[PDB]
Design a binder for this molecule. Structure first.
Ligand SMILES: *[C@@H]1O[C@H](CO)[C@@H](O)[C@H](O)[C@H]1NC(C)=O
Lengths: 434, 16
C-alpha cells in the first residue's frame, strides 16, 4: 500500500501496461515495483564525478573541476522493446534496459556525442518525453527539454542500425530555436493522439510587451519527423489569468481508454484552476493557424492577423495555393515554419481554489460520471466530481505527505481500482472507492 | 457559467 525508500527522493513513475510493473526514477536509484508495490529490482545510478562544464565520459585530466554529483532521474518511459532511462548527470545521456529485468542493460552508447545529450542536466529543470514510431516501424523518442545553464524539442532514434548512434537526432529532426534562455521553456507533458504529438509547456511570450510566461499547447505530425508542421497555440484559462500551467491529463477509464478532453491545472503568478480544452478545438485552431499562414499570409479572410512565425526563424507566412494544404498537410522543406497562433484557445475555469497550488491531475469515469484526482503542492490528493450539478469542492481529501508536492505522474492501475500517488518521499496505491 | 462534464460522453457542457 506504500513504498518509502529511506534516504532518497522520487522523481518519476512509469507503468508497463502489458505487465503492470511500476518503475521508479530516484536520486541515484531505479526501482522496479510489482503492482503490489513489492520491490523487484534496484539499480544504482550515482553518484558519479561530474561538472556541467564537462562532457561524458568524465575524466580527471580533461575535467579536474569534477566532483561527486547525485543523479536525480530526469526521464523514465516504457518503450515497445525496452525501458528508457535518462538521468540529469553526464549531460542528460540515456540508456535502455530490459522490461521486467531492470538490472540488465540493453543499449548504452559508449562515447556519447554532443548530439546525444538528451535530458536536462539540471535537476531543477524538467524533461518530458513520448515514445512513437516511424513510417518504417522504427521506434522514435520525442523529447521536450527546458532551458538549462540543445533544441527544446527533438525526435531521436531509439534503436537505429548502429546501436552507438542511439538517442541521436538528425539535423532536421529538431525544433531550431535561437534565444533559448529568453524563451526559457518549462515543459509540462507530451502526449499522442491520432496522427499527432502534442507538447504542453510554459515559455516567455516575447511577442508580448511584458514578456511574461505563458502556457502553450503545441502540435506536430508523428510521421513527419521534420517539425515542418510544428504549430503552437497559446492557452487562455480565464484569458490567461491563470497563466502557469502545472499539470494536465486526459480522461482514462475502463470504458474510454483515452478521452477527447484535456483537463489542465493552472496556477496564478495565490490560487489554482481546472480548465478543459476539447482536443478537436485544439486541432481546429492549429488547422486554422497552419491554413492561414500557408495560403492567406497569416491572416483571416477579413485580413486580421491570426498566425505568424515564432522563435525568430527566418521564415514567413506565404500565399501558397490551397492545394498545398492537401499535397503537404505536414508541410515541407519550404513551407513557413515554425508557426504560432495570435489567437488563444479559451477555457472558463471549472474550478477555482483560492489557496491551492495544483501540481498533478488524473481524470477517470465511473458509471458515466467524470471524477478528477488532483494533487497539490502541500501533499494533498483531492477528489472532485466534474459532472452536471457539481459543487467545484472536493468530495474527498487525503494527505499523502504533508508539505511535499504531489507528482504529475499520477497513474491508474489496469482496472482503474487504484491510483498510484507519489510525493518526493513516498508512493501510494490508493483505492478509488470504498 | 462554469463548464461541466457530460455524463458518459465526456463532452464538455459549456452552460448549465
Ligand atoms: C485538421 O486538418 C487535417 C488536415 O490534414 C484534417 O485531417 C483534420 O480532420 C482536421 N481536424 C479538424 C478538427 O479540423
Amino acid at each position: 500500500t506504500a513504498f518509502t525508500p529511506n534516504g532518497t527522493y522520487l522523481q518519476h513513475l512509469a507503468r508497463d501496461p502489458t505487465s503492470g510493473t511500476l518503475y521508479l526514477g530516484a536520486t541515484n536509484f531505479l526501482f522496479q515495483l510489482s503492482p503490489g508495490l513489492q520491490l523487484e529490482a534496484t539499480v544504482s545510478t550515482g553518484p558519479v564525478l561530474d561538472s556541467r562544464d564537462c562532457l561524458p565520459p568524465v575524466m580527471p585530466d580533461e575535467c579536474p573541476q569534477a566532483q561527486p554529483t547525485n543523479n536525480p532521474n530526469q526521464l523514465l518511459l516504457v518503450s515497445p522493446g525496452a525501458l528508457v532511462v535518462c538521468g540529469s548527470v553526464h549531460q542528460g545521456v540515456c540508456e535502455q534496459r530490459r522490461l521486467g529485468q531492470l538490472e540488465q542493460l540493453l543499449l548504452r552508447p559508449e562515447r556519447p556525442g554532443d548530439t546525444q545529450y538528451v535530458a536536462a542536466n539540471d535537476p531543477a529543470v524538467s524533461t518530458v518525453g513520448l515514445v512513437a514510431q516511424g513510417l518504417a516501424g522504427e521506434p522514435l523518442l520525442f523529447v521536450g527539454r527546458g532551458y538549462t545553464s540543445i533544441p527544446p524539442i527533438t525526435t531521436r532514434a531509439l534503436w537505429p542500425p548502429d546501436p552507438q548512434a542511439a538517442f541521436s537526432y538528425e539535423e532536421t529532426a529538431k525544433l531550431a530555436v535561437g534565444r533559448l534562455s529568453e524563451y526559457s521553456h518549462h515543459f509540462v507533458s507530451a502526449f499522442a493522439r491520432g496522427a499527432s504529438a502534442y507538447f504542453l509547456f510554459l515559455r516567455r511570450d516575447l511577442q508580448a510587451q511584458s514578456r511574461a510566461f505563458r502556457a502553450y499547447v503545441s502540435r506536430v505530425c508523428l510521421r513527419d519527423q521534420h517539425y515542418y508542421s510544428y504549430v503552437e497555440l497559446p492557452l487562455a484559462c480565464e484569458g490567461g489569468r491563470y497563466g502557469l500551467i502545472q499539470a494536465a491529463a486526459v480522461a482514462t477509464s475502463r470504458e474510454v481508454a483515452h478521452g477527447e478532453v484535456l483537463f489542465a491545472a493552472f496556477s496564478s503568478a495565490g490560487a489554482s484552476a481546472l480548465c478543459a480544452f476539447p482536443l478537436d478545438e485544439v486541432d481546429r485552431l492549429a488547422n486554422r493557424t497552419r491554413d492561414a499562414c500557408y495560403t492567406r499570409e497569416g491572416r483571416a479572410e477579413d485580413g486580421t492577423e491570426v498566425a505568424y512565425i515564432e522563435y525568430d526563424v527566418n521564415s514567413d507566412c506565404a500565399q501558397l495555393p490551397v492545394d498545398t494544404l492537401d499535397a503537404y498537410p505536414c508541410g515541407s522543406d519550404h513551407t513557413p515554419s515554425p508557426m504560432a497562433s495570435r489567437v488563444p484557445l479559451e477555457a472558463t475555469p471549472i474550478l477555482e481554489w483560492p489557496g491551492i497550488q495544483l501540481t498533478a491531475v488524473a481524470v477517470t469515469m465511473e458509471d458515466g460520471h467524470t471524477i478528477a484526482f488532483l494533487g497539490d503542492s502541500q501533499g494533498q490528493l483531492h477528489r472532485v466530481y466534474l459532472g452536471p450539478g457539481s459543487d467545484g469542492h472536493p468530495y474527498s481529501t487525503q494527505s499523502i505527505q504533508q508539505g511535499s508536492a504531489v507528482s504529475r505522474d499520477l497513474t491508474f492501475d489496469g482496472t482503474f481500482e487504484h491510483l498510484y500517488v507519489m510525493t518526493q518521499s513516498t508512493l501510494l496505491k490508493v483505492p478509488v472507492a470504498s | 457559467x462554469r463548464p461541466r462534464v457530460a455524463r458518459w460522453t465526456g463532452q464538455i457542457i459549456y452552460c448549465s
